[PDB]
């Protein structure tokens, strides 16, 4: 028996902009509140459990290129 | 018994933009009030118990290529 | 038995910007009450209980590439 | 039984900006109380309990290349 | 029986950036207060309870490349 | 001529109440945007321009006695 | 001419209450903007531009008895 | 030509209240902005040009007696 | 010409209370911004430009008797 | 011409209360900018111009009681 395994690939991901400019986030934050007693997390878990957390998150550029390689025998 | 594996790919994936300009984000944060007791999560969970979280996720660019290669045998 | 495993790849993940500007992040802060009792965790847990964090995560050029490669016998 | 293992792989994965600017943050604090008893971690945790912590993470030029280079027998 | 490994990469992580600027970061720390009786940590745990700190973290040049490089018989 | 002036005025204005109990006031706070160029008050003005101001005004007992003693000659 | 003036006036402006109790006032401050070149206040003015003022003005006891006595000749 | 005045009263303005109790006043923060040019104020004023102030005024007791006593000749 | 002026006045202002309690008062300091050029102030003017001042005012025992007793000739 | 002038007053302003008790005040402190040029005050006046001052003004007892006492010829 004989496996092959090439997997080839280009790509140019491109990103160009000019100038992004003013960006603004003026939030008036608000109120949250929870009320809980118990819980019993496991095995790969992740939560959030109240929050006020806002974000500014401006990349000149996003972009992202995923490639999951797999093979079994 | 021969296996042949050659997944070739090419792609300019493009992204112009002269330019963006003045995003504006203003917000009224509101209320939120939960009420739970108990739960048990397990085994690949991922959660949100009551979130005032606003976001500005503004890149010049945005792409993502996804390729999951895979083969069994 | 043989097995093959020549994965190539090329690629330029390109992430042009002119100039990205007066970024402004002006959030009014809320507010936030948890109330529990109990928890256990295990087992590959992260979490947040009660968080008020703002963020700027303002790169100039954001691009991840990311490849698994894996194999099994 | 042969086994054969060769990952090839270039990529520039390119990073330009002019000029990122004046950017801003300006947050009002707002407010958080937790009110837990107990809890019991164990294996491979993260948490946070309570968190009023902003951020300005801006770096001139974000990338990250993650390749999980594995194989069994 | 045989293994082979040769897992080749080139790659130029680039980050280019002319000049960042007047970053400015101005909070007003609000306020914080948990209010626990126990807990019992084990088995690589991390975490915090409570924390006001606020972060600047501007590097011209932000990348980190990962290979995790493994094998088993 | 002769003026004469004799109200009289007797009264229990009497506000009896036994517990006013668990009053809830949980508001989302909502948005204004008011845009004017110019204005000219004059004379035993009061006004408001804009105003996001929630109130609680729970008094236990609440009464007004208003007596307006006029006369001319 | 004789002019006479005897307002006389009893009253009990009475405020009992027990227990008012458990209030709350949970607001989630809302956004106001305004945008104005000019104004030109004169003779008795009172006013608010622009106002997040939430308020809890809880007496236990709320009452005003008022009296404007005049007279004129 | 004869004027008289005798403008007598009683009153107990009475304020009983047992206990107030457990109040609270838990808001979050929003936003304000204004944006004017120029003003000119004369002859009594009071204004308020952005405020985000907020009130606690629990009195045990709140009465107000006025009596704008006055007369003319 | 005789004037006469006998103003009498009894009045017991009374405010009980047996016990206020626990209040509480927890914001979160939102934002404000303002922008002026100019002004002109004259002849008995207040004011507030820009304020984020919270107050808790709890006095046991709140009352004001005022009486502006006047007269002309 | 006679002028006469007996202003008689009598008032016991009481104010009971037991215990005020556990009070709180628990802000986060938000955040102001003002932005001005030029202004030119004259004649009486007061004024603020930017502010974050909380307060607690809690008196065992507040009562203010005020007799503006006037006349002319």
Do not use: A, F, G, W
């Given at each position: 028996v004989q496996i092959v395994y090439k997997p080839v690939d280009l790509s140019?991901?491109?990103?160009?902009?000019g100038s992004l400019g003013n960006i603004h986030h003026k939030p008036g934050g608000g109120q949250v509140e929870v009320k809980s007693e118990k819980l019993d997390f496991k095995d790969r878990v992740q939560s959030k459990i109240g929050s006020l957390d806002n974000i500014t998150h401006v990349p000149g550029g996003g972009n992202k290129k995923?490639?999951?390689?797999?093979l079994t025998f």
């Open positions: 140019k991901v491109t990103s160009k902009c995923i490639e999951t390689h797999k």
